[PDB]
Structure 1
Amino acid sequence: CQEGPRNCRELLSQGATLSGWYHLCLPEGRALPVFCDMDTEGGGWLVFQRRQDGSVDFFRSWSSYRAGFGNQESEFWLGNENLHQLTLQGNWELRVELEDFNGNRTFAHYATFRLLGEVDHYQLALGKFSEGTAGDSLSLHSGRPFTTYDADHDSSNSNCAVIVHGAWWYASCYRSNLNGRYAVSEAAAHKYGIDWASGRGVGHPYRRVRMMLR
């Protein structure tokens, strides 16, 4: 990792103005492909999660969430270890984008986002809510470890990941569940899906979601 840029803002500043896949050079000297959104809200956003069509299975294990998974062309999770390494230094603001089946867009912004390391179960450290038409459904999850079906760290007598078919910084269980089970419409919706409580509520999911940092 022969130098490279440290984030999407730096790529943009350097003249990379089209959104798409770029390599960042991580602090440890490892190259990482990432999707940079160079257009929304001034550009320079590192998109680390995307839901679009239900083509990719998000009901995955600790190791899968740790390393990342999915398809560049469609849906993915960048990986918790990548996110921890990226967010160690610098202030990264979080933007969440949501789109319902009508094509109505809503959003949520948070001042900072950081994940602790694997020993701390990639615990979420979330900054304060700034603004968002979708409302705040992630603050509850701040301070909580990540749990998957094979790594129960939540505050429930059960395994929330198993219970609600996802992976997240579950409590018992959630106000948000963006790595939840995909549904192509309300009819096909699951009890627990790609939900944002303060927007459309539990059991009433979104068609497209993105989570992004700048």
Structure 2
Amino acid sequence: CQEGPRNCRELLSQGATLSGWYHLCLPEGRALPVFCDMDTEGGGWLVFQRRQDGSVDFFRSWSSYRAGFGNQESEFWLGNENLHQLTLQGNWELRVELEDFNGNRTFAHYATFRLLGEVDHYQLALGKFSEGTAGDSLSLHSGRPFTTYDADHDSSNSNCAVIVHGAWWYASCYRSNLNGRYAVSEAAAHKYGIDWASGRGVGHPYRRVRMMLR
């Protein structure tokens, strides 16, 4: 791509008012299919992660997390390199949306979100918590490198990704684990699941999750 829209706000501004899959032209001149939410909170949100049904396996390698994986019509991880490139310029606010098995929605908002490069293991650079009924469960993870089952960078004597079955900016191990193993009900819940500590707490998973930037 020579050029095209740099982000979902630009798309909205030019009259793309329906949420859905669009192409962004990234700073290096590469076109990237992304999901834009044009409707929630004024719209213009780049949805980079979504859990909905357990249809997609989230227990994936460093390379899969780097490049992205999943299905456009359901669950996906956009990819760490994409997120690093997107967030190299500009301030992007993070909105996390969580929905439990009862359909109760709760949200968390952080002022900025940025990923460092692969050399720094896509370390998370997270702004301060602004508001959210779900509470703050990502602050712990700021300043921490990403780890996967084949790339242990956490602060644990073991590999947190293996132990807890996911991929995240693990410490030893987490306050949030949104890329963790899917569970279709509280009865099928895993020891460590799609957890938000300040929300429903560790071991008490959610039914739907999105992470998104604007």
TM bucket (normalised to shorter chain) is over 0.9
Q: How does 1:89-100 map to 2 (within 5 A)?
A: 89-100=89-100
- Report how far residue 3 of structure 1 moved: 1.2
- Report how far residue 94 of structure 1 moved: 0.1
Cα shift readout 1:74-133 (whole Å, capped 9, x = no counterpart): 000000000000000000000000000000000000000000000000000000000000
- Report how far residue 34 of structure 1 moved: 0.0
Distance in 2 (CA, whole Å) between partners of 1:126 and 1:43 is 21
Cα shift readout 1:129-185 (whole Å, capped 9, x = no counterpart): 000000000000000000000000000000000000000000000000000000000
Distance in 2 (CA, whole Å) between partners of 1:25 and 1:162 is 35
Partner SS state of residue 4, structure 2 = coil
- Report how far residue 212 of structure 1 moved: 0.1
- Report how far residue 63 of structure 1 moved: 0.2
Aligned length: 214
Q: Structure 1 residue runs of 4+, over 4 Å off?
A: none
Instruction: Give the TM-score of the pair, scaled to structure 1.
Output: 1.00
- Report how far residue 187 of structure 1 moved: 0.4
% same residue: 100
- Report how far residue 2 of structure 1 moved: 2.7
Aligned partner of 2:47 in structure 1 is 47
- Report how far residue 51 of structure 1 moved: 0.1
Distance in 2 (CA, whole Å) between partners of 1:95 and 1:186 is 24
Which consecutive unaligned segments of at least 5 residues does structure 1 have? Answer: none
Aligned partner of 1:213 in structure 2 is 213
Distance in 2 (CA, whole Å) between partners of 1:54 and 1:196 is 17
Cα shift readout 1:20-63 (whole Å, capped 9, x = no counterpart): 00000000000000000000000000000000000000000000
- Report how far residue 203 of structure 1 moved: 0.2
- Report how far residue 204 of structure 1 moved: 0.2
Partner SS state of residue 34, structure 1 = strand
Distance in 2 (CA, whole Å) between partners of 1:173 and 1:124 is 15
Partner SS state of residue 119, structure 1 = helix
Partner SS state of residue 18, structure 1 = coil
Q: How does 1:150-189 map to 2 (within 5 A)?
A: 150-189=150-189
